[PDB]
Amino acid sequence: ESTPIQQLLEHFLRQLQRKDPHGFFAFPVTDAIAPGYSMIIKHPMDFGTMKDKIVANEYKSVTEFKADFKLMCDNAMTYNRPDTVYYKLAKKILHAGFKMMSKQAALLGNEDTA
């Protein structure tokens, strides 16, 4: 009883979460472990929240899903300093994670891999 967009975003979410083996983006960030986050980050986002929107069919497109992934990465680079594991990890997986999802859609339009 699954949905085509569900199965595709479960695949994408799996691929990206492998680039965070310690789960720094697995759960919503709380002020207990990040003082002031509630006040500096107006729209928080995490891998766990994206999974719930997948399960609840709240994504109508791949673009909506990519916006939540970028916002989660952008939040981590706003609230944290550049010399932090959170900034470095969020910078690497944001980029590596966009190309990864772009090269999989791109091979369907290329004459050699279609």
Ligand SMILES: COc1cc(-c2cn(C)c(=O)c3cc(C(=N)NC4CCS(=O)(=O)CC4)sc23)ccc1OCC(=O)NCCCCCCOc1cccc2c1C(=O)N([C@H]1CCC(=O)NC1=O)C2=O
């Ligand atoms: C690392 O802290 C966290 C960080 C973040 C986070 C995020 N982002 C994005 C951020 O952007 C961000 C920014 C942050 C911040 N404050 N930065 C400052 C830095 C300096 S500045 O830049 O100047 C100012 C700003 S924090 C943060 C968020 C949350 C975090 O979490 C907190 C925490 O500690 N939970 C506790 C949960 C348990 C932890 C250990 C997990 O353990 C488990 C869990 C489940 C199951 C098992 C285990 C386990 O051990 N086992 C063993 C048992 C034995 C066995 O038989 N087998 C096993 O496997 C299990 O079964």
